[PDB]
Amino acid sequence: MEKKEFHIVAETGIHARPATLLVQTASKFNSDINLEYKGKSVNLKSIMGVMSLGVGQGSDVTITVDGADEAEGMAAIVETLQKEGLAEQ
């Protein structure tokens, strides 16, 4: 059980594109990985929750990873976060 915070550096608006990008990468781990924005942590893939939340404009958020993938899980997210210019390291 380990969480990894971050901040949106895409200043895009975490849309279905970048929005899912993370969720897609976060919601693809055998571990518990979610996103937390403003303090709200929900299965990034949680459109509903995320929807109401969503980030972008240098918006900062926090990711979480718990389980086996935990490492790999967050690994991607983390990397992706800064890989997709969605979030920084």
* Eight-state DSSP code of residue 64: E
Determination approach: NMR
- CB 56, CB 8: distance < 8 Å: yes
* 67-82: b (≥16 Cβ within 10 Å) or e: eebbebbbbbbbebbe
Which residues belong to the active site? 15
Nearest-angstrom CA–CA distance, 47 and 89: 24
Instruction: Give residue 38's region: left, alpha or beta (phi > 0; psi -120 to 50).
Output: left
* Eight-state DSSP code of residue 36: E
Q: Which two tokens stand for residue 5?
A: 């915070």
Q: Which two tokens stand for residue 67?
A: 């389980």
Q: Which CATH superfamily is domain 1-89 in?
A: HPr-like (3.30.1340.10)
Nearest-angstrom CA–CA distance, 58 and 75: 21
Domain boundaries, the chain: 1-89
